[PDB]
Amino acid sequence: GSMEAVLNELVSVEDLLKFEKKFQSEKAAGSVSKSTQFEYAWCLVRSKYNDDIRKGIVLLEELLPKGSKEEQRDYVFYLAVGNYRLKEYEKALKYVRGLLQTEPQNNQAKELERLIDKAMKKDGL
Amino acid sequence: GSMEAVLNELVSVEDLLKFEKKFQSEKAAGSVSKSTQFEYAWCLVRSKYNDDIRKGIVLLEELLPKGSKEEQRDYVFYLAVGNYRLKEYEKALKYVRGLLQTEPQNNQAKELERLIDKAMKKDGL
Ligand code: NA
């Protein structure tokens, strides 16, 4: 599908609250999983609200050294998304260019790079 | 990420209205694209509302003979999602098993098949 649609997607209230409650439950139990932390962070970085996106970025950065290679690909993609949403354009490009270093022919990553750069330059940065 | 999360995702009000307005604009112009029709159908089949999901399924079935191979993969996946959401379990399984015929090692499709079958049997069907 469309990278622009995925990059600009806003999570629903219902899904954000569903995975927030799931994360809170595991944290209460003292047994947080990479899977649930990622599901919650995936919702947070797609929120309309700055404080949510910032929290989602922290949760993804926590996951990064714990992920297998196939997991880290997902974390880095949504770290690019989340930083883009905060106008952390430099960091967003750093994350996507890391992905491209490992996957130079990944044109989905290339399109994400274009969409971040377009926004950054539109903002005068 | 998680197939269960993707299968049960509810689209946000903002995205559904964004792509609905985009589709309406192209229809008004007389120039509907596969891309925009798919974006709108992708939101519709993730709606909470039956009439939306049904309309999204029609729009995807319209796209099926117009899609390249890589496009049809996306259409069939979200035809499985949409039919699952309507408790059209037979049709949902038909769509995912079509995907598996062409991609037998696609374990994401396999997990989608399990999640549809689990729901179908839980419903006594
Ligand atoms: Na919403």
From Swiss-Prot, chains A, B:
Determine if Methyltransferase is one of this entry's keywords: no
Q: Main localisation, per the record?
A: mitochondrion
- Which residues get modified to Phosphoserine? S12
Q: Name one GO cellular component term.
A: mitochondrial outer membrane
Instruction: Give the result of L112P, as annotated.
Output: Approximately 40% of cells display fragmented mitochondria. No change in binding to DNM1L
**Example GO molecular function:** identical protein binding
Q: Tell me the outcome of changing L44P.
A: Less than 15% of cells display fragmented mitochondria
Q: Which UniProt keywords apply?
A: Acetylation, Apoptosis, Membrane, Mitochondrion, Mitochondrion outer membrane, Peroxisome, Phosphoprotein, TPR repeat, Transmembrane, Transmembrane helix, Ubl conjugation
- Describe the task this protein carries out: Involved in the fragmentation of the mitochondrial network and its perinuclear clustering. Plays a minor role in the recruitment and association of the fission mediator dynamin-related protein 1 (DNM1L) to the mitochondrial surface and mitochondrial fission. May not be essential for the assembly of functional fission complexes and the subsequent membrane scission event. Also mediates peroxisomal fission. May act when the products of fission are directed toward mitochondrial homeostasis, mitophagy, or apoptosis.
Subunit and interaction comment: Interacts with DNM1L/DLP1 through the TPR region; may form part of a larger protein complex at the endoplasmic reticulum-mitochondrial interface during mitochondrial fission. Interacts with MARCHF5. Interacts with MIEF1. Interacts with PEX11A, PEX11B and PEX11G.
| Protein family (similarity comment) | Belongs to the FIS1 family.
Q: What is known of its domains?
A: The C-terminus is required for mitochondrial or peroxisomal localization, while the N-terminus is necessary for mitochondrial or peroxisomal fission, localization and regulation of the interaction with DNM1L.
Q: What is the protein's given name?
A: Mitochondrial fission 1 protein
Source organism per entry reads Homo sapiens
The coding gene here is FIS1
Report the portion of the entire protein shown: 1 to 123 of 152
